[PDB]
Design an enzyme around this catalytic site. Structure first.
Site, PDB file in Angstrom:
ATOM      1  N   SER C 127       0.606  -1.231   0.138  1.00  0.00           N
ATOM      2  CA  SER C 127      -0.012  -0.021  -0.018  1.00  0.00           C
ATOM      3  C   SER C 127       0.821   1.242   0.057  1.00  0.00           C
ATOM      4  CB  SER C 127      -1.075   0.004   1.101  1.00  0.00           C
ATOM      5  OG  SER C 127      -1.459  -1.281   1.510  1.00  0.00           O
ATOM      6  N   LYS C 153      -2.019  -1.168  -4.036  1.00  0.00           N
ATOM      7  CA  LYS C 153      -2.936  -0.326  -3.364  1.00  0.00           C
ATOM      8  C   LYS C 153      -2.403   1.359  -3.231  1.00  0.00           C
ATOM      9  CE  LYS C 153      -4.876  -1.851   0.534  1.00  0.00           C
ATOM     10  NZ  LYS C 153      -5.501  -2.184   1.871  1.00  0.00           N
ATOM     11  N   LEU C 154      -3.039   2.290  -3.904  1.00  0.00           N
ATOM     12  CA  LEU C 154      -2.843   3.723  -3.672  1.00  0.00           C
ATOM     13  C   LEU C 154      -4.073   4.297  -2.741  1.00  0.00           C
ATOM     14  CD1 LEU C 154      -2.831   4.247  -7.496  1.00  0.00           C
ATOM     15  CD2 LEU C 154      -1.016   4.190  -5.868  1.00  0.00           C
ATOM     16  N   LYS C 155      -3.441   4.714  -1.538  1.00  0.00           N
ATOM     17  CA  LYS C 155      -4.487   5.626  -0.900  1.00  0.00           C
ATOM     18  C   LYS C 155      -5.230   6.695  -1.887  1.00  0.00           C
ATOM     19  CE  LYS C 155      -2.803   6.699   3.203  1.00  0.00           C
ATOM     20  NZ  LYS C 155      -1.810   7.984   3.207  1.00  0.00           N
ATOM     21  N   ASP C 180      -7.253   2.413  -1.764  1.00  0.00           N
ATOM     22  CA  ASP C 180      -8.056   2.780  -0.380  1.00  0.00           C
ATOM     23  C   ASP C 180      -8.553   4.004  -0.286  1.00  0.00           C
ATOM     24  OD1 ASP C 180      -8.451   2.424   2.427  1.00  0.00           O
ATOM     25  OD2 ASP C 180      -6.297   2.170   2.975  1.00  0.00           O
ATOM     26  N   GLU C 205     -11.651   0.289  -1.681  1.00  0.00           N
ATOM     27  CA  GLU C 205     -11.822  -0.214  -0.199  1.00  0.00           C
ATOM     28  C   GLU C 205     -12.357   0.786   0.697  1.00  0.00           C
ATOM     29  OE1 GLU C 205      -8.559  -2.109   2.940  1.00  0.00           O
ATOM     30  OE2 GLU C 205      -8.167  -2.223   0.907  1.00  0.00           O
ATOM     31  N   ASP C 230     -13.498  -3.502   5.082  1.00  0.00           N
ATOM     32  CA  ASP C 230     -12.370  -3.525   5.846  1.00  0.00           C
ATOM     33  C   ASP C 230     -12.836  -3.489   7.254  1.00  0.00           C
ATOM     34  OD1 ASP C 230     -10.177  -3.232   7.606  1.00  0.00           O
ATOM     35  OD2 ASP C 230      -9.126  -2.159   6.240  1.00  0.00           O
ATOM     36  N   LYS C 254      -8.763  -9.119   8.409  1.00  0.00           N
ATOM     37  CA  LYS C 254      -7.573  -8.729   9.385  1.00  0.00           C
ATOM     38  C   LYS C 254      -7.937  -9.555  10.515  1.00  0.00           C
ATOM     39  CE  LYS C 254      -6.348  -4.257   7.785  1.00  0.00           C
ATOM     40  NZ  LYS C 254      -6.666  -2.700   7.779  1.00  0.00           N
ATOM     41  N   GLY C 282      -3.236  -6.033   6.615  1.00  0.00           N
ATOM     42  CA  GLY C 282      -2.080  -5.902   7.602  1.00  0.00           C
ATOM     43  C   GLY C 282      -2.130  -4.635   8.285  1.00  0.00           C
ATOM     44  N   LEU C 284       0.909  -3.132  10.320  1.00  0.00           N
ATOM     45  CA  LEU C 284       2.276  -2.557  10.642  1.00  0.00           C
ATOM     46  C   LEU C 284       2.820  -3.559  11.811  1.00  0.00           C
ATOM     47  CD1 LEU C 284       1.886   0.219   9.503  1.00  0.00           C
ATOM     48  CD2 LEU C 284       3.675   0.541  11.224  1.00  0.00           C
TER      49      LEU C 284
END
Lengths: 360, 360, 360, 360
Positions: C127, C153-155, C180, C205, C230, C254, C282, C284
């Site tokens: 991402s 994945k681009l914000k 995202d 998303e 999500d 998740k 994910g 982090l």
């Protein structure tokens, strides 16, 4: 003019029941007055998801530093200055509701008035736990009907629903009667709950999962008794989604669960716009919470008696100087600015587990 | 605290356009201050069903008598006191909105602040009429885009729609662009309207009957451009119904059309609960009406720019002392209590065509 | 055979980013082995409603006491033993997931194997945050496409969405590309989002409220790009409801958000039964959380690449001895029993900010 | 570690009833243990579509050569190694279920445990065939209620439904009662089946075609008694489609019919995610099948008593060394690894029509 928030106290008190309820209080100070409010979260997450350890850490580590020292136009500006964080509505309500009390006090205006209500008395009902049989149920209703409570609510569970309801409606063909299904049923119980239809219940409250609307909607198609939503409406958009889905026709509105007075008035107004009534729910509040509730309840779509019964019913002695007592099922709005009630600081000190002061 | 309405003045002005527009003012006197509001009904029923003749008759013969000499906790109590009469929402709004102004001045708080708004300025666009051609259209749009207005609304009709939109959109591919379809279409024109889709309009405003929700919902399923409702939403429940139906994705909210500020707050809240934005519409108001609008526009769901541009666009001389001018598409909230504006009595007298005073 | 949980350690680490990220570890001791899991809740409620303060309090004051000294047949019995508390799914997940690890190590089997997965490696994407411009966007995407990552994945936000997508899609017309939308939109933006359709994104998303299903369903009917859920899906029944509603065609799963591996298996199974794919998201994680994720990702309905890239992208030094590095978009399953990874105790001590031990 | 499948035996036995049932067994050998499983297909296609000649040819000609000699991580990897072929779920179940028994035995773990269940006893009910009149029906229920079976199931057919049900519910107002409609009705019988509603049946089982959902959904709208699906749910996606269509609210789950334990747990979990219960159905299995059933039934959404009654009820002498006997309607989970039951090879030899061994 605008109000500046100078200081804040968090006081956690252990109030003797009638073993104890932990009462979390936030007191906001500014403009030489102070607004007060009561957490409705519990030590453990039983009624809903938040907890005291969680909410207090959020208050002292995130919300108070956001607002301490800042100047605001209104309570809505206080909410908005938190704003980014997710969930935790009871915790935010502590800040939002104390801001309302403060705001109103800087103006000299009763809280209900500022929120647009104009009832002087609000009607109240009583909640009955599960009793050991039919006549014990009926004898306890009889008492409450006699004290003039204006709605009767029975706790029910699978195995014990049709019976206490039948026995009650037989003895009391005309009273306003509801049941608390307390999230204890499933869709498989549809034919069983349908048997309640013939007893003309005002509603059945939150029969299925605490966080559900979709299934409640399906249930509502399968029985004729209206559904009331409690835990599953935590915002104005929840109420909008609930009513548009047919998840219910009635909402048990608890001010703190939804985020405080602004959002409550929003839920109230969304409901009214579907012509669905709300009522004001209870959380065993101390005089602080009870008084916020009574002030909120003066709004016109609170068209069903609320769960703000007499404080003497819960506490041998309350945290506030004023007695909040219902007579014949009417609870008067405490006169005065803001909530119109006042902490008894010395009595409070005798039951404080912990206190802290925060500044900018 | 509580307020007593002692006197009321109906003052009708004839204000020359930069021939004329009639401005019916209501002034309420209580507690050493006054509240002022402006009627938005016309001499004839062109924008909607109410008329000056009928509204004034209803004020002097029913609403004023119901309030004069009486004491009230809030504007809500005032509205409540007017009875169960049907319709006549702009008439009701004169009293309701004057009461808000009066109320807020008894407290020394700005009106917006009491309605929950905390914005210090609001975004505004403009509405252009029909131009002779594509280039004249673009020209006129250009002057306004160069004034910094944040939305451009073009009036349309068959068969003058795709042209001015395409011309405009080609010259200005980034600007926020709506059309006003002026109830001049039917379901038959859906194909024609669909051709607007590729020009990224924020919405098409009220293309079908002025009092319709159902056909609009049908039309919304046939084209991708959101529809915006105006005449069709005269209350919070109309808003509920519109949005549940899918009749629109946007509402043009006119405070007086819905009966005033409280009901406007509610409309705005019902929209926001559906994730629908509102904006503040206009009715060529003098500075009284316009100040009322600006205050209301501070609430947070006014997320699209309002038809609320500069006083000096319409009048060589406005009826208030204060200038209401927008710079770069931002209208500042006029400071002071209530509406923040003050009648220019001397000037008003020179343009008054009628006045009466009512007492208890 | 059956396992007895004797002790538990809560160990909170502060791990510097390549300033910092807090890692709450739970370690369960039983039958000569241990199970380790990592909390995904933050200090504050930014991704969701839970907080470190509240989750730890709930572990030490409720969940651990419920399990210490007790004997269990499987992780399912463990979860069952925690009671009917509401929400707090990430808290529950710490215990649940540690129990899986412990359980699997008593048997000497890899965790994935016990969950039904049989893949020897899993596909991963990355991402990217918001870039200053189209070219910087493409640049950053280029470095990753050249690493062989299988999804980008681009914000996005208004009004930075169509640009980075079009720029990216023009440079890379074949790559799997999602965005995202970070809950930063409303139903009003549907037209804007629809403009993404022509760029063949695998999905958008969570563009609306983090806790919403119903509006998402409405939005999904207005645009052709699948939506991916999500924050909105925190259990198997939420998944059921989302998919029956048409709220999404894809779920970002998740493990800790849904309460752990068993419930994750179920979510994954409920998706697959609707023909909806999942992928492994994910948070982090350090190598503990990350190893947990990789194992889960072996189940067969994880048909879209997971947000599960290289340890060394985030940390100069991870908390485990084993390297978790992906090559060419493939993450190998770490070998050994349970999670296949082992705490680096010495290094962990240097970054520990708190620790406690609980016994029966 | 992984398991290698070295050999396989197909044994077909003719077990004396109490004329005979043909019992097809598959025994898989590897890692010095062996897993065993029982075909539920019949010589002719009466309950469903598969047959013994068909299933055995598929086993020895296609499934066993696919898996003989190969090494696998888990039972799911065994399924997947077949995978391409269509239908034939009972045949695949023989391989999949024996793989589960093997797997579990290489680990030393009871089968139910590996599938995540943790009940020690499972509740059981009894199925009653059509009796000659009402009192014969009631007298046979009376017996079974007395032996403490926890659900009563009556076979019904057109001409004989309301009567045995009325007579039964009269005598037994509180028992858990269901009916087997055995695919014998049509939509034209809707008004007749509706007459069952007043008798509070837990459900009516597969009233219409064995392979239908759509019509069952229509029927479910026309009567209030819930529908239970049996033959028409042969996969997790079937269950998803059934519940989302309203074809039923209950599933009779037979492990072999759906493909084996993995897929069964999937159906189980899909149902739970709709809050619909399942129960474990019967097929006159030998101790081998009966034991797989009991192990599957320990899963939590098996919330209705299953059809795994006492083996003594079917066979004078069973194929396994252990007696599977229910006492007071509770059937204990046979202790031991895998199924916890063991073939009696010598008794088996006395009733073997045919046997074969296959290797790589």
């Amino acid at each position: 003019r605008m109000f500046k928030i100078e200081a804040a106290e968090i006081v956690v008190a252990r109030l003797p029941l009638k073993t104890h309820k932990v009462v979390p209080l936030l007191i906001l100070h500014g403009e030489g007055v102070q607004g007060v409010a009561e957490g409705t979260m519990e030590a453990r997450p039983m009624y809903r998801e938040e907890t005291i350890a969680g909410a207090l850490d959020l208050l002292r580590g995130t919300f108070l530093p956001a607002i301490l020292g800042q100047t605001f136009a209104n309570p809505e500006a206080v909410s908005d200055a938190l704003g980014s964080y997710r969930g935790n509505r009871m915790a935010r309500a502590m800040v939002e509701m104390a801001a309302w009390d403060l705001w109103a006090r800087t103006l000299g205006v009763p809280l209900g008035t500022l929120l647009g209500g104009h009832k002087e008395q609000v009607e109240v009902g009583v909640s009955l736990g599960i009793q050991a049989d039919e006549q014990a149920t009926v004898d306890l209703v009889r008492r409450h009907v006699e004290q003039g409570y204006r709605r009767i609510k029975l706790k029910i569970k699978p195995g014990w629903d049709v019976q206490p309801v039948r026995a009650t409606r037989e003895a009391f063909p005309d009273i306003r009667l509801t049941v608390d299904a307390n999230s204890a049923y499933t869709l498989a119980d549809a034919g069983r709950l349908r048997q309640l239809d013939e007893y003309d219940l005002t509603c059945i409250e939150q029969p299925l999962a605490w966080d559900d609307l979709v299934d409640h909607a399906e249930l509502a198609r399968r029985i004729r008794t209206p559904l009331c939503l409690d835990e599953s409406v935590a915002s104005a958009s929840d109420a909008r989604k609930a009513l548009a889905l047919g998840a219910g026709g009635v909402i048990n509105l608890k001010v703190a669960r939804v985020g405080g007075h602004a959002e409550s008035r929003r839920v109230h107004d969304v409901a009214q716009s579907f012509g669905a009534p709300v009522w004001c729910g209870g959380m065993l509040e101390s005089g602080i919470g009870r008084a916020h509730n009574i002030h909120l309840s003066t709004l016109s779509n609170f068209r069903l008696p609320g769960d703000t019964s007499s404080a003497s019913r819960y506490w041998e002695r309350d945290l506030i100087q004023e007695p909040l007592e219902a007579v014949d099922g009417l609870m008067p709005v405490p006169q005065g600015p803001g909530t119109g009630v006042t902490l008894d600081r010395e009595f409070l000190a005798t039951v404080t587990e912990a206190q802290e002061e925060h500044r900018a």
